[PDB]
Amino acid sequence: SGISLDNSYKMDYPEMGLCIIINNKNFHKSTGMTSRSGTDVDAANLRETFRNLKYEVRNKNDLTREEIVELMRDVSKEDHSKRSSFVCVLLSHGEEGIIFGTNGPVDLKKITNFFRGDRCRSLTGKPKLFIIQACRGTELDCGIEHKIPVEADFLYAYSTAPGYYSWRNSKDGSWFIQSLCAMLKQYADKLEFMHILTRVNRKVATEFESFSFDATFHAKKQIPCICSMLTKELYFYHL
C-alpha cells in the first residue's frame, strides 16, 4: 500500500450522521422572553442545507429546558457507529454559555457533555459540531469605517462574539444562519469547513448592518466566532 496521511476526518461512513435542529420560537409567557420572528426561516434553511449534505435532519420546535436535556441525552445514547459526525443547531435566546428552553435556561456545557469522548463512545474521534444562533450578552458592535482529551473533536460555531448580542431579521432569518447556509450551499463540495466558516465570518461582517428606529440599536455590526477543538480537517465530501 502507498503512503497514507490522516489529516482529515473520515467522512465516508455509511451515514453522515444526525443533524438535530432545536428551533425555539415561542416562549412561556412567565419567562418574559419575546417570540423569535424569522427563526422558522432559519430552521427551514438549515433543514434543506443539511439535507443536501446527506445528514439525517431532525427538527424540534419549542422545547422546554427539560425537553432539551432529555432529547440530547436520548440522542447521545443512540448507536452512532455507522455515522461520520454529529451536528446540533441551537436557535434560541441565550446569554454567555447559556441557551434558553421555552421555560428557562440550559447550560451549553450540560448539553455538550452528553457527547464527550468518554460519554458517547460511538462518536469518540468523530467531529461534533454545535452551531449556535443565540445572544452571548448585551454588547453591541458599533463598527468602523487516556489517549485523547474528552473535550477534543468539538466545534462551536457561534453566531456572535463573546459578550455580544446576535442579530436576527424577522423576515429573512438570522444574519448568521442565512450566511452559513449560503456558504455551505456554495462551498461544501469545495472547501474545508474552517475555510467555509471563515467565509461566513466575512459575509456577516461585511454585508449586514442593523437598521433600527432606536438609536441604541441602529447601525450595528456582528462578527461570528469560530471556536474549534477539532483535531483534523473536515470535508463534507469524500473519495
Partner: peptide, 4 residues
C-alpha cells in the same frame, strides 16, 4: 432587525 431584532436581537436574540
Amino acid at each position: 432587525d431584532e436581537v436574540d
